[PDB]
């Protein structure tokens, strides 16, 4: 029973993207103060929060509203989260609902005893001061409310994408990266959670590499461990989760070769959760998701 909760617009998209990518084994909950945006969620569960406070009109990028929204719907949320062994709280920080409600939600999940992993993006720098300040204030609050908080620096999306990809695609990629963040883990639980729990605190940074071709597993893993989303050196990590995903052509030669590349770069006595998953929808693409915690 692992629930992925998209909170606010940032999460709404991730959860959509996850669903779009047919990420299995999770129950999705899309939570929003904005009834209009929320009705776009492909989630089976759409939880409008702060219905009384925001009247479906959203939090206006006011984290205090998203918060009071979530506090208002404190009972509706626990009902939806009860039974969750693990809750991914995915959200965009900088906003109102994402920034404000996700800590409330994640904290509820954490109190419910679920392994609470927040996976959030920190707004692009370009989103401006308000977005940056609020997320900062917000990411600070996610950290107190989750077991593990994977924070994806959107600004690093811009290093990754072509220098000319339009802003719309830059946001889009943030959503995918958020989806990539949760699928990276959720695909490994579809297993004693105290394994994963021991790997879930402090903040976490993740990296992704995607590659195709003859030397891809290494290409992917090198790109993963070096990826701009992954801002610090993995040797600094106390724990590392590694996800390898590829087509039915994924060979253990490829798998370990990637594992060797991630492993060498991590500390020797590091704790590690490592999985390789086969994605039939892949052909020659391979995706290494690496999440480091420390």
């Amino acid at each position: 029973s692992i629930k992925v909760i998209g909170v606010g617009g940032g999460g709404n998209n991730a959860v959509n993207r996850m669903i779009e990518n047919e990420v299995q084994g999770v129950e999705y909950i899309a939570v929003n103060t904005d009834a209009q945006a929320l009705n776009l969620s492909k989630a089976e569960v759409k939880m409008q929060i702060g219905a009384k406070l925001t009247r479906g009109l959203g939090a206006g990028a006011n984290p205090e509203v998203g918060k009071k929204a979530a506090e208002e719907s404190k009972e509706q949320i626990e009902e939806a989260l009860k039974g969750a062994d693990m809750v991914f709280v995915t959200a965009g920080m900088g906003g109102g609902t994402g920034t404000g409600a996700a800590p409330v939600i994640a904290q509820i999940a954490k109190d419910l005893g679920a392994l609470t992993v927040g996976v959030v993006t920190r707004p692009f720098t370009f989103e401006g001061r308000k977005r940056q300040l609020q997320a900062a204030g917000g990411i600070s609050a996610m950290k107190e409310a989750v077991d593990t908080l994977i924070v994806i620096p959107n600004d690093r999306i811009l290093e990754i994408v072509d220098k000319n990809t339009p802003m719309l695609e830059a946001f889009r990629e943030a959503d995918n990266v958020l989806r990539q963040g949760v699928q990276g883990i959720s695909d490994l639980i579809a297993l004693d959670f105290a394994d994963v729990k021991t790997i879930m605190k402090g903040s976490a940074l993740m990296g992704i590499g995607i590659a195709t071709g003859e030397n891809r597993a290494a290409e992917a893993a090198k790109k993963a461990i070096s990826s701009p989303l992954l801002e610090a050196a993995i040797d600094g990590a106390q724990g590392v989760l590694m996800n390898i995903t590829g087509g039915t052509n994924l060979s253990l030669y490829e798998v370990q070769e990637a594992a060797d590349i991630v492993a060498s770069a991590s500390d020797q006595d590091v704790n590690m959760i490592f999985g390789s998953v086969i994605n039939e929808n892949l052909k020659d693409e391979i995706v290494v998701t690496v999440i480091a915690t420390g």
């Binding site: 297993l191 060979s251 030669y253 798998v255 492993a263 020797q268 704790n271 959760i273 490592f274 999985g275």
Partner: protein
């Protein structure tokens, strides 16, 4: 600890423990497809 699940396998343990387990599995399974 090594978890087979459909569509994937998850190894838990120290990094070296896994690298080694992967090599062992590298001798007995060609593709992760066949592995599961």
């Amino acid at each position: 600890k090594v978890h087979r699940m459909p569509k994937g396998v998850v190894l838990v343990g120290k990094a070296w423990e896994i690298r080694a387990k992967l090599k062992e599995y590298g001798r007995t399974f060609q593709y992760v497809k066949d592995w599961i």
